Amino acid sequence: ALMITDECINCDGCEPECPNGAISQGDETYVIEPSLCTECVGHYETSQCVEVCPVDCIIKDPSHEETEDELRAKYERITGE
Ligand code: SF4
Ligand code: SF4
DSSP states (O other): OEEEOTTOOOOOOSGGGOTTOOEEEOSSSEEEOGGGOOTTTTTOSSOHHHHHOTTOOEEEOGGGOOOHHHHHHHHHHHHOO
16 A cells, blocks of 8 residues: 655645545545555556655555555455456
8 A cells, every 4th residue: 555645735636536535634634544545456557646646745655565466456345346
């Protein structure tokens, strides 16, 4: 999963880009719910939130390091099949 750092400027741009609804507004920044963050695998070849973030404050979360398979499995759990 990814995380949003303290450098987030609360621009609102990443929330509508998440296919899994993993992003919401937090206390001082936007936040990723790691149980919904597939790093976009299954939907897109690259993270959509990273693509729109104006200040590059979306990074791998080292306390949720996931393989492509784990992420895929997560994608399948969220969307079904
Ligand atoms: S990487 Fe993809 S799944 Fe994770 S929060 Fe960003 S847009 Fe959502
Ligand atoms: S796109 Fe980047 S700066 Fe804007 S709300 Fe999301 S994480 Fe914060």
